[PDB]
Design a protein around this ligand. Structure first.
Ligand SMILES: Cc1cc(C)n(COC(=O)N[C@@H](CS(C)(=O)=O)C(=O)N[C@@H](CC(C)C)[C@@H](O)C[C@@H](C)C(=O)N[C@H](C(=O)NCC(C)C)C(C)C)n1
Length: 389
């Protein structure tokens, strides 16, 4: 309920990523690690790279163990190859422990590291099932729970600023919190509502209904989880299956039709700008995702605002304009509840009880007329049928 030691231990932002400080090896080598609930490999740059200010030097760690085995990991965008081994790992602003964990030493990569992101590795927090080479490589959190008394769960509060941040600003500000082993009540308001983790591979959940300003998209619910629906702190946008994306964009365009935007905007590629302070938030609809509840035939809903799905970006011109990119895009691999969703809520990854909790975030961006919300319950039947097989 109270872990002041870990509150505000994250830095970063959408687009580039949210990261936590970790140390690896002996003596401790400090590295910034991206928090990624969408994968299960712990990996770190281990050789010079144009975008890396530092990297893992195995030859300088007295505790480094070479597993003599290579590993390859591809992501929706980006990929890397590395060499497997183990070493001692600690988290300065996390529990006071030291765990021996598997570490992939990245030796080659493509479209993975991000210039200026300030992170040098990735912490895959999902399950062994999707770890590479296979489920035999124990993920970091599994090691943590097995080697310590830290409870089997963590929570994330990702904080979007609501406006663009320059390099010095992102470096000097709080990007959020990752509470390891517990929940901190100062990070949310209202109550926590839980949805079942369908299966332990990605953090998969089941969406049972979608609304645009209260109006039902009215699609066969399997379409919403077509292939799957996951919660991923390593993805910026709310990504939706092709059919759902098209239906959603049609409805969002209709609700905001008093103003017309170019196709490039809806494709998530180009920005739309308004005179400083005049963004017409009210013309854009709220989006509600209903999730299966823990009680039979019960569901709840999470609702985000345009302040969540319109991502702030700096306008090239020295203009004092407020510009944004549409942060909802299509996916051919299922729904991805990325930062667009996570910046609106405090998310509890309760692995012990196989469930994910959502509560309104104490740091979500909004205005005087609307706020993000988590509400329930709703009598919903045959939710099990919403899952895709
Ligand atoms: C917040 C935040 C953090 C970061 C780094 N961004 C910017 O990058 C992305 O949003 N990257 C997405 C691609 S996009 C722009 O939606 O199309 C992405 O691929 N994120 C991955 C992490 C980054 C650091 C490479 C991962 O979070 C996505 C996840 C679904 C994934 O690809 N998992 C892998 C996977 O499923 N691989 C199989 C196929 C897709 C190669 C694992 C299981 C091996 N936004």
């Amino acid at each position: 309920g109270s872990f002041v030691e870990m509150v505000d231990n994250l830095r970063g932002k959408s687009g580039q990523g949210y990261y936590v400080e970790m140390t690896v090896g002996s003596p401790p080598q400090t590295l910034n690690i991206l928090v990624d609930t969408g994968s299960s490999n712990f990996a770190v740059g281990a050789a010079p790279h144009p975008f890396l200010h530092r990297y893992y030097q195995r030859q300088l760690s007295s505790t480094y163990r070479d597993l003599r085995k290579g590993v390859y990991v591809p992501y929706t965008q980006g990929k890397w190859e590395g060499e497997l081994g183990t070493d001692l790992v600690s988290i300065p602003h996390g529990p006071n422990v030291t765990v021996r964990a598997n570490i992939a030493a990245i030796t080659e990569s493509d479209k993975f590291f991000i210039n200026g992101s300030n992170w040098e590795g990735i912490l895959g927090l999902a399950y062994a099932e999707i770890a590479r080479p296979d489920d035999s490589l124990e993920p970091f959190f599994d090691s943590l729970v097995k080697q310590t008394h830290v409870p089997n769960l963590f929570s994330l509060q990702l904080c979007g600023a609501g406006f663009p941040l320059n390099q010095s600003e992102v470096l000097a500000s709080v990007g959020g919190s990752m509470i390891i082993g517990g929940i901190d009540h100062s990070l949310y308001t209202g109550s926590l509502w839980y949805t079942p983790i369908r299966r332990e591979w990605y953090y998969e959940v089941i969406i049972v209904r979608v609304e645009i300003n209260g109006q039902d998209l009215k699609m066969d619910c399997k379409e919403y989880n077509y292939d799957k629906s996951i919660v991923d702190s390593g993805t910026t946008n709310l990504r939706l299956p092709k059919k759902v994306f098209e239906a959603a964009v049609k409805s969002i365009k209709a609700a905001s039709s008093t103003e017309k935007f170019p196709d490039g905007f809806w494709l998530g590629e180009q920005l739309v700008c308004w005179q400083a302070g005049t963004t017409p938030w009210n013309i854009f609809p709220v989006i509600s995702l209903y999730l299966m509840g823990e009680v039979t035939n019960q569901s709840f809903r999470i609702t985000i605002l345009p302040q969540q799905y319109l991502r702030p970006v700096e306008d090239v011109a020295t203009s004092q304009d407020d510009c944004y990119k549409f942060a909802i895009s299509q996916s051919s691999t299922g729904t991805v509840m990325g930062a667009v969703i996570m910046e609106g809520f405090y998310v509890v990854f309760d692995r012990a009880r196989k469930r994910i909790g959502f509560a309104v975030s104490a740091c979500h961006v909004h205005d005087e007329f609307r706020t993000a919300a988590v509400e329930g319950p709703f009598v919903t039947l045959d939710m099990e049928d919403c899952g895709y097989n």
